[PDB]
């Protein structure tokens with residue numbers, strides 16, 4: 217017979233069968249995955265910081281004396297060999313939480329009699345320990361994942377350029393007005409326009425020794441090319457320097473124009489080729505709880521964008537986005553769940569939204585669509601999302617951000633250097649470009665899987681699915697009619713989950729709510745019922761103490777986290793025996809806080825384990841209070857508790873305080889608030905007639921996109937010749953007379969050889 221143990225024997229991962237460039241290259245070629253002609257880049261060499269950044273010399277109080285820049289002669293080919301953990305030879309990297317499991321089993325045995333509701337917790341945790349494993353996966357899994365990305369983009373349902381499907385930059389931007397309302401960059405709104413290099417984004421206000429405008433980047437993530445094996449914090453100076461140089465070289469090429477008889481293309485192609493590496497990401501293997509059976513066939517990838525490319529794109533993206541908290545909870549008609557938080561009465565409000573008689577109705581967050589239809593809740597995901605994204609998808613997103621975010625009442629708050637970068641360079645850098653895995657520079661299909669960088673592109677993709685959903689009279693998500701939306705758009709999607717009779721099930725939560733922390737203020741004997749909405753990973757349960765619905769983390773997610781904790785990740789001179797225990801207090805208490813409090817055995821076992829570490833440290837004299845000062849950064853669930861300034865306690869009071877309703881933040885939209893909902897906008901757009909609500913800046917961006925790269929400064933001017941003649945009254949009749957004006961100056965680029973394509977081909981020469 218079979219063995220089956222109470223505690224599974226230490227798992228030994230299989231040998232990675234693609235641990236060689238030779239082997240990997242074979243696999244990619246065998247699947248028709250494209251391997252690029254290897255590009256090389258100059259060796260990094262020292263240079264005085266005073267010389268490269270003279271304007272940032274005043275860092276003489278409280279920089280790094282020299283900088284390492286890709287300037288020295290002798291080219292090298294870049295190499296990225298990430299470590300996979302666990303592995304066959306080093307298997308003990310991330311052990312399952314056996315101490316937790318033993319404690320749960322222990323407490324179950326202490327219970328006088330029976331109870332299978334309790335035992336289900338021990339079963340579920342055990343099943344996770346057996347089936348899954350936390351780690352970096354394998355090269356074989358990464359490569360294998362990539363072939364799936366190519367299949368999404370070029371196989372079953374090949375990607376479609378939205379502009380060749382009737383959509384325009386403006387009509388898309390009018391849809392994003394509803395599904396992603398955006399304001400101006402800013403409290404008080406004192407922000408600078410997109411007209412300067414990153415160096416001058418720090419201002420020496422008041423002479424004789426600083427206002428900070430640069431987007432925030434986390435100092436611990438990898439720098440990327442040209443600094444493999446270095447972090448963003450270690451390359452801050454370098455990141456600015458390269459961005460400066462690139463943007464300065466760009467503004468020269470536009471200042472110089474296209475020259476006589478196009479004798480300046482060489483200068484453009486020269487530059488783009490020299491900065492090829494700005495379009496090459498590192499295939500970082502993402503660490504998560506993969507299941508053992510697919511350890512060799514699925515490993516999620518993070519496309520580590522080079523820091524200059526990130527900095528420049530986030531200079532366009534972040535000042536707008538970190539200042540637009542506009543969602544379903546503060547704008548009527550709005551389906552966006554952007555910056556939604558389930559605490560502070562947040563979840564109750566979504567549940568009340570569901571209970572409302574209205575249907576069909578949709579909610580969006582990036583690559584997530586939630587739909588209630590015929591009293592059924594549908595949770596929908598785009599297949600790989602990023603993989604479906606084309607360059608025109610992103611340049612449409614860029615058009616939207618610059619139009620509604622970086623424009624004062626029609627007027628552009630951006631120069632032509634930033635306009636040309638956003639419309640014609642940035643999408644080519646990040647979508648359908650390349651990545652460096654081992655020593656191999658290989659193509660990426662669609663956008664690379666970031667998670668912050670990919671938000672707006674994915675949200676756009678879903679917005680199109682939503683528009684298309686409206687156009688065919690809002691069919692039931694499971695129907696054939698709904699499924700035909702992916703054949704029409706080239707975007708892959710699938711129903712992740714559906715709950716029949718959603719309103720009845722939600723209502724029943726009020727009746728069947730058990731005693732607990734939020735109902736009677738006691739330690740729960742039994743789990744209180746939930747509806748597993750998976751609303752951004754959150755479920756709904758009812759609180760009798762507060763009289764409202766309160767969030768509990770999705771049950772599978774909760775027990776998936778409980779089974780395999782994330783690693784510490786680097787521990788230098790900072791203590792020794794204290795840190796290991798201290799992290800466990802964080803681990804166990806944070807588990808309770810997100811939803812462990814609802815699950816009697818998990819709640820009690822976590823409480824005991826945390827209390828055990830807490831008492832040990834308290835007798836040892838560890839500064840635990842000072843440690844937990846920003847526990848938010850130390851926990852994998854910390855994001856949801858950011859700026860909340862609340863202690864790790866998980867009591868009746870703390871849980872009630874965490875959920876006590878607070879009025880939603882006032883919306884910040886740069887234009888008069890639209891409250892018509894998406895359904896109406898979809899029909900107004902299908903007619904073909906719609907107003908150019910972008911203003912002048914929209915005509916500037918249409919000219920920049922629709923003409924040649926080097927003739928960008930002429931493009932703005934020709935669009936201003938149009939703006940001075942007052943018609944606006946229809947976008948299409950306006951858009952076509954602009955295309956003629958571009959043909960009158962011979963600046964309009966040839967079909968299939970657009971400004972965006974030319975820079976794509978230039979990036980690998």
Ligand SMILES: [Mg+2]
Pocket residue numbers: 583584585586595596597712
């Ligand atoms: Mg979803």
Ligand SMILES: [Mg+2]
Pocket residue numbers: 583597598599600601602
């Ligand atoms: Mg997706």
Ligand SMILES: [Mg+2]
Pocket residue numbers: 582583601667670671674
């Ligand atoms: Mg996303």
